[PDB]
Design a binder for this molecule. Structure first.
Ligand SMILES: [K+]
Ligand SMILES: [K+]
Ligand SMILES: [K+]
Ligand SMILES: [K+]
Ligand SMILES: [K+]
Ligand SMILES: [K+]
Ligand SMILES: [K+]
Ligand SMILES: [K+]
Ligand SMILES: [K+]
Ligand SMILES: [K+]
Ligand SMILES: [K+]
Ligand SMILES: [K+]
Ligand SMILES: [K+]
Ligand SMILES: [K+]
Ligand SMILES: [K+]
Ligand SMILES: [K+]
Ligand SMILES: [K+]
Ligand SMILES: [K+]
Ligand SMILES: [K+]
Ligand SMILES: [K+]
Ligand SMILES: [K+]
Ligand SMILES: [K+]
Ligand SMILES: [K+]
Ligand SMILES: [K+]
Ligand SMILES: [K+]
Ligand SMILES: [K+]
Ligand SMILES: [K+]
Ligand SMILES: [K+]
Ligand SMILES: [K+]
Ligand SMILES: [K+]
Ligand SMILES: [Mg+2]
Ligand SMILES: [Mg+2]
Ligand SMILES: [Mg+2]
Ligand SMILES: [Mg+2]
Ligand SMILES: [Mg+2]
Ligand SMILES: [Mg+2]
Ligand SMILES: [Mg+2]
Ligand SMILES: [Mg+2]
Ligand SMILES: [Mg+2]
Ligand SMILES: [Mg+2]
Ligand SMILES: [Mg+2]
Ligand SMILES: [Mg+2]
Ligand SMILES: [Mg+2]
Ligand SMILES: [Mg+2]
Ligand SMILES: [Mg+2]
Ligand SMILES: [Mg+2]
Ligand SMILES: [Mg+2]
Ligand SMILES: [Mg+2]
Ligand SMILES: [Mg+2]
Ligand SMILES: [Mg+2]
Ligand SMILES: [Mg+2]
Ligand SMILES: [Mg+2]
Ligand SMILES: [Mg+2]
Ligand SMILES: [Mg+2]
Ligand SMILES: [Mg+2]
Ligand SMILES: [Mg+2]
Ligand SMILES: [Mg+2]
Ligand SMILES: [Mg+2]
Ligand SMILES: [Mg+2]
Ligand SMILES: [Mg+2]
Ligand SMILES: [Mg+2]
Ligand SMILES: [Mg+2]
Ligand SMILES: [Mg+2]
Ligand SMILES: [Mg+2]
Ligand SMILES: [Mg+2]
Ligand SMILES: [Mg+2]
Ligand SMILES: [Mg+2]
Ligand SMILES: [Mg+2]
Ligand SMILES: [Mg+2]
Ligand SMILES: [Mg+2]
Ligand SMILES: [Mg+2]
Ligand SMILES: [Mg+2]
Ligand SMILES: [Mg+2]
Ligand SMILES: [Mg+2]
Ligand SMILES: [Mg+2]
Ligand SMILES: [Mg+2]
Ligand SMILES: [Mg+2]
Ligand SMILES: [Mg+2]
Ligand SMILES: [Mg+2]
Lengths: 118, 146, 64, 205
RNA sequence: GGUGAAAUUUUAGUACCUGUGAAGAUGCAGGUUACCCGCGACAGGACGGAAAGACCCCAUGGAGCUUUACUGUAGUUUGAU
RNA sequence: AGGUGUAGUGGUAGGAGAGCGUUCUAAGGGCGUUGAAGGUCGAUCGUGAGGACGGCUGGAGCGCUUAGAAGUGAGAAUGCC
RNA sequence: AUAUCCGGGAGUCAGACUGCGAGUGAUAAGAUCCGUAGUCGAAAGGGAAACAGCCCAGACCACCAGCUAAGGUCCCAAAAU
RNA sequence: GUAGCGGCGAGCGAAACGGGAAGAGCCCAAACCAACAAGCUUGUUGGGGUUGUAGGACUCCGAUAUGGUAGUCUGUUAGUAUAGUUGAAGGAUUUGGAAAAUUCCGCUAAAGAGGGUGAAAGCCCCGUAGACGAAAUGCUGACAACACCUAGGAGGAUCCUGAGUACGGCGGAACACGAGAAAUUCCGUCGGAAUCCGCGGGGACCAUCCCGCAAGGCUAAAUACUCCCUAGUGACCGAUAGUGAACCAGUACCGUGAGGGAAAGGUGAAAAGCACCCCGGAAGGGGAGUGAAAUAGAUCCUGAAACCGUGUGCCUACAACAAGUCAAAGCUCGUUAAUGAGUGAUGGCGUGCCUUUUGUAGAAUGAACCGGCGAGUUACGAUUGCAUGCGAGGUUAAGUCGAAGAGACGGAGCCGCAGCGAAAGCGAGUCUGAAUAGGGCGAAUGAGUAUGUAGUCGUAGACCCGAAACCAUGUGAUCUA
């Protein structure tokens, strides 16, 4: 028999337009522009789920570096000293101690400095 | 069976492949034809046996022989097929036709000595291979050219 | 419509018992002074259609 | 095998015996499926057509010059991408019928008949007699035999009044013993066959 | 004040320099400059618009033309009947 | 039926496999003026095509299961309207 | 842990750069033409400011966890002023 | 897709036999006879006669029967087409504007096909099954009438049996057959027979044998097609589809003309199509009404998107931004309740989609946007995979009956079971060869076939769109020469 276009076409395009809500001007309005930008958004979103892991480790290291220097030590020497002392605390936890519990961070720094001397 | 519970035998029926219905099907866009050229075109392609202008194989080779207007081809019956009849049977082109052994006798029945004959028969046929004649008579039967 | 046999091929090849094709030999028409006796003797013998060529011409002889 | 015999009044008389080659074989489900599909296809009429670009009215001339107008090149107003243009491919009148090998047809018919017996859906009656055709009476016979589901009533040739009285009931399908198809049998939940109809079937098969 | 088109147009929040890159980038890199919105003007750029380059090459494309190209042929002429 | 272990899982042309959705047919089983399809909205589900469930709109038809047949899926054709 | 062999289905016959070995060239060309290996093609990620073909390295997915490669550690900008 | 034809290319491509549908045979010319008319023949008429196991004339006898028909507005009769008649069985209840929906109990059915009715009805309507009906005019079939045909056997002395014909040369054509070794048929041209002791064909030609008897005509059925008419059917369309045309369409409109050729369906169950009032010149609104509903008010069902506007929760006047993405305060909100939603200062990262390319963000191509439409299909064949049935076997085709079905019958035919050889031919072998040799192809060392389904191919427009052009009928000198 004859199968006319029906409603499938509209349904499919409406899904893309919903993904494009909040985009500027025609990019949330017109299907072709919206689909092109949703594709680019997907490309960015996948790439950025990898990049966010890089960015946060970059943030923690910088914060640990600032706290390390306040304890008479560079970031690189502190991580060497913690490794020598068998401390497995990760950079997310160290950065959190650097900001929220400075006394605990100082206790870790002292253990690292002790391990470096030995 | 039930009309609301029909099921074909496994592997008896397959789904047709539709080309040019999107890229993820693997036959989207170019529909399996690749890129340009004569074979990408609608109705494109060269005739069977065309070698792009190299002299085709058949032109390279000589024509041979002729067909004989009077050529006679015989329907072949071997001895193993005559073991199907009981001892003393009269094996005839009519009998072989009724048995369904020889539906088309062509220029006639010819008997050949492929297998071993084990029953005594009086065999009637257009022609006999010398070996077939010996086997039939060695079995204590007899042959007759019709 | 029925597929048509390639008549020129049908005049040049024969279907053998194994389903292969028996063929004559090229270079068996003239200029025999240009060929050794060994060449003439061995071109006298028939050959078969090669695998690559057979796949190209097989449809043209389906009902030969 | 053996099947209970009923009279038109509904009391069970002694059993009868059916040929085992016809009603006793193991049903071949794949063969039945093939027969069902083929028969359904054979009923198709295939009267469907569309106009391709040559059949559509008009369209001979080239709409505009090949070059220079800035428009897409067009060869006819009836080209398929045009509104009102010819249809590309699409339905063309054709038959949908094909014939299975005879042996397969026979096996299919025996399968459905042997399946009805195996499920005890084959109710054999001595006879169905009516002085005059009356639906209410046949309806009462179906009640006599405790048949409330779709039934194929298989009558011997010449039983006009039984056929007349049965046919209007929405759950009844009437055939004669010599015109019985696989689709007829598979559709029915039950088969009601007179004794002479069963004998005729066994002579046909 | 009234009336009211058009070519064009992938979406555009549409700078400069040097560089880079399909080797000449408003959009990439680095740096520099730049508050938001217009109006009247000018045309350097958007390899601006218009036309599926006409030059050039190609397609065992097309057409018109020529001749001691090939093959035919109207006409003309000569003989036989 | 699942479990363990090891290994593997970028991809154009292209080959293979398995599915989603559309209209129609058959059978079965169902839903509809106590509101069908369609439209619209929502923060919903699945590995994907896609699938539900609610509110509103709407006013008559339409799902589901199994099988069948297909004018069966569009974003590009200086495509047509 | 592949090899052949038989058969169904293809696509491909514009390649590019880089290293190395040669020719052509002026031991010019992002030149041309072979051989040989790689990458691109058909490969995202990190480095080379940007930079298909170089260096490191092959993305089934999730993580605000860890270790490294090339390359890096004064600020932009993660890490030894 | 065989035999053949064929720049032996591309391609073209039979026929007879076998199986079916349907079947049916007959009249002339001539001899000869009779009549008439004319210039012993030489015409007209009527008789006679009709062919190949040769027939007929003729001469003998012997029967005026028996059979047949593709004759006629010859009537009579029946049927049938073209109007019609008749035709079973339901009320309540719940919901609703309305019941056919629902529930409850009933009933009718030779009718449960279908349509309509205020939603979906076997029982309300039109119908349906069934029964029934024709003044008139056709059509058909019989029957009758009438007309028209229809003689057996034996004899051969003689006579007849289609001439400028057959046939031949030359030039063309048709035969599947392209001049070919080219028979058979035909056309033009020229030449040109025999005639029963004859003539033609059997694929050059001759002999023999066999089969036929040209140069005269007619003939039902089986076959092709459907502008129209009647009744229906559809895994056909459902208004961008389906006819170009559902609508006042071959219309409007374009063109000198031939010719080209559109767009355009839907209020509601019923108009009950908004009395009256109010603003306005009107248009149009606001009330009031109608209605189940008028945001169903005629541009009228539903009413998407582009596009245009109004309100406003959050943000925005130091910023260079394919515009997103990841991180993120603040503010405003509260969900399919989910480690929620909207907005978003600020920070990191980041050159669209497609096509085509060695390589494109590309300063190459394509798209203004949105919506709809728009491209590997079908038929017949080839072949392979998968599947089913049967298996050294498998299977029917046309056709007949049958629902436009299944099925039954139908074995003609096709594939397979044996190959080898150019072929005669031999045969589990065979060909080559002097060969018991060697070698080629086969067997040893078996699986096929029917159908379905899918992949691919072939013939067809063959996935869709696009040339410049070519050819063949027509229309134009109202412009211009
Ligand atoms: K392919
Ligand atoms: K050959
Ligand atoms: K030669
Ligand atoms: K470029
Ligand atoms: K300018
Ligand atoms: K020209
Ligand atoms: K909804
Ligand atoms: K299509
Ligand atoms: K378009
Ligand atoms: K190289
Ligand atoms: K590689
Ligand atoms: K054929
Ligand atoms: K050729
Ligand atoms: K007569
Ligand atoms: K009704
Ligand atoms: K009458
Ligand atoms: K000839
Ligand atoms: K003959
Ligand atoms: K003859
Ligand atoms: K409405
Ligand atoms: K707004
Ligand atoms: K950002
Ligand atoms: K350009
Ligand atoms: K041998
Ligand atoms: K030998
Ligand atoms: K099989
Ligand atoms: K197959
Ligand atoms: K086509
Ligand atoms: K095709
Ligand atoms: K004039
Ligand atoms: Mg569409
Ligand atoms: Mg299919
Ligand atoms: Mg692919
Ligand atoms: Mg695409
Ligand atoms: Mg392309
Ligand atoms: Mg190419
Ligand atoms: Mg190609
Ligand atoms: Mg050449
Ligand atoms: Mg020779
Ligand atoms: Mg040599
Ligand atoms: Mg046309
Ligand atoms: Mg334009
Ligand atoms: Mg149309
Ligand atoms: Mg550069
Ligand atoms: Mg530049
Ligand atoms: Mg940017
Ligand atoms: Mg960048
Ligand atoms: Mg330009
Ligand atoms: Mg061009
Ligand atoms: Mg991987
Ligand atoms: Mg629908
Ligand atoms: Mg389509
Ligand atoms: Mg569009
Ligand atoms: Mg180069
Ligand atoms: Mg490429
Ligand atoms: Mg890369
Ligand atoms: Mg690229
Ligand atoms: Mg740092
Ligand atoms: Mg230092
Ligand atoms: Mg009534
Ligand atoms: Mg009721
Ligand atoms: Mg010819
Ligand atoms: Mg002749
Ligand atoms: Mg002549
Ligand atoms: Mg004879
Ligand atoms: Mg006729
Ligand atoms: Mg229309
Ligand atoms: Mg519509
Ligand atoms: Mg139209
Ligand atoms: Mg409304
Ligand atoms: Mg409306
Ligand atoms: Mg500033
Ligand atoms: Mg500010
Ligand atoms: Mg280039
Ligand atoms: Mg672009
Ligand atoms: Mg630009
Ligand atoms: Mg453009
Ligand atoms: Mg004129
Ligand atoms: Mg005039």
């Amino acid at each position: 028999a004859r199968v006319k276009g029906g409603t499938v076409t509209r349904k499919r395009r409406k899904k893309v337009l919903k993904l494009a809500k909040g985009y500027y001007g025609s990019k949330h309005t017109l299907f072709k522009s919206a689909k092109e930008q949703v594709m680019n958004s997907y490309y960015y979103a996948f790439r950025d789920r990898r990049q966010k892991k890089r960015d946060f480790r970059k943030l923690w290291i910088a914060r640990i570096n600032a706290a390390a220097r306040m304890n008479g030590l560079s970031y690189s020497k502190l991580m060497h000293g913690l490794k020598l002392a068998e401390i497995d605390i990760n950079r997310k936890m160290l950065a959190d101690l650097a900001v929220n519990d400075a006394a605990a961070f100082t206790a870790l720094a002292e253990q690292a400095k002790d391990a470096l001397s030995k | 069976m039930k009309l609301h519970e029909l099921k074909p035998a496994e592997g008896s029926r397959q789904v047709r492949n539709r080309v040019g219905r999107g890229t993820s099907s693997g036959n989207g866009k170019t529909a399996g034809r690749g890129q340009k050229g004569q074979k990408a075109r609608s109705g494109g392609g060269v005739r069977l046996g065309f070698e792009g202008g190299q002299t085709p194989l058949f032109r390279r080779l000589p024509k041979r022989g002729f067909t004989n207007i009077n050529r006679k081809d015989y329907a072949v019956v071997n001895l193993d097929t005559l073991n199907r009849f009981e001892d003393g049977t009269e094996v005839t082109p009519v009998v072989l036709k009724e048995a369904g052994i020889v539906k088309n006798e062509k220029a006639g029945i010819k008997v050949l000595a492929d297998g071993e004959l084990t029953k005594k028969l009086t065999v009637k046929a257009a022609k006999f291979s010398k070996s077939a004649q010996e086997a039939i008579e060695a079995a204590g039967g007899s042959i007759e050219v019709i | 419509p029925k597929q048509k046999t390639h008549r020129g091929l049908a005049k040049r090849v024969k279907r053998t018992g194994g389903g292969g094709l028996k063929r004559g030999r090229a270079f068996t028409s003239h200029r025999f002074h240009g060929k050794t006796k060994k060449q003439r003797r061995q071109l006298r013998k028939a050959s078969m259609v090669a695998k690559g060529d057979y796949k190209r011409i097989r449809q043209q002889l389906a009902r030969m | 095998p053996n099947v209970a015999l009923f009279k038109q009044d509904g009391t069970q008389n002694g059993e009868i015996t059916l040929n085992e080659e016809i009603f006793g074989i193991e049903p071949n489900e794949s063969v039945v499926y093939d027969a069902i599909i083929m028969q359904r296809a054979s009923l198709r009429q295939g009267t469907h057509a569309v106009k391709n670009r040559s059949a559509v009215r008009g369209g001979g001339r080239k709409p505009w010059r090949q070059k220079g107008t800035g428009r897409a090149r067009q060869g006819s107003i009836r080209s398929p991408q045009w509104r009102g243009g010819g249809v590309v491919f699409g339905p063309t009148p054709r038959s949908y019928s094909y014939k299975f090998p005879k042996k397969v047809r026979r096996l299919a018919m025996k399968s459905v008949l042997s399946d009805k017996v195996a499920e005890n859906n084959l109710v054999a009656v001595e006879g169905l007699s009516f002085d005059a055709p009356k639906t209410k009476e046949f309806k009462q016979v179906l009640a006599n035999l405790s048949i409330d589901t779709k039934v194929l009533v298989v009558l011997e040739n010449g039983n006009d009044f039984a056929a007349l009285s049965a046919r209007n009931l929405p759950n009844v399908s009437v055939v004669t013993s010599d015109n019985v198809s696989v689709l007829d049998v598979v559709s029915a939940n039950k088969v009601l066959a007179t004794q002479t109809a069963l004998t005729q079937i066994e002579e046909v098969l």
